[PDB]
Amino acid sequence: TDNTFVSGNCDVVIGIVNNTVYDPLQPELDS
Amino acid sequence: TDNTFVSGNCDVVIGIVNNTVYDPLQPELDS
């Protein structure tokens, strides 16, 4: 999430591909 | 962590110094 920014949706940009975005705050929830 | 980014290791950079990088998320999890 630090190297990219969320904008628009997936039905607008042509040629968009599916993938997983790593969130550094998710693994930190255990602490 | 917001003012710096992670690249390479400490055995490459010549003249690297040791310090503590403040992570804003640490006190937020403590609070």
Swiss-Prot record, chains A, B:
Glycans are attached at N18. It comes from the Viruses. Subunit of the fusion protein that is processed upon entry into the host cell. Mediates fusion of the virion and cellular membranes by functioning as a class I viral fusion protein. Contains a viral fusion peptide that is unmasked after S2 cleavage. This cleavage can occur at the cell membrane by host TMPRSS2 or during endocytosis by host CSTL. In either case, this triggers an extensive and irreversible conformational change that leads to fusion of the viral envelope with the cellular cytoplasmic membrane, releasing viral genomic RNA into the host cell cytoplasm. This is Spike protein S2'. It comes from Severe acute respiratory syndrome coronavirus 2 (2019-nCoV). The chain holds residues 1117 to 1147 of 1273 of the full protein.
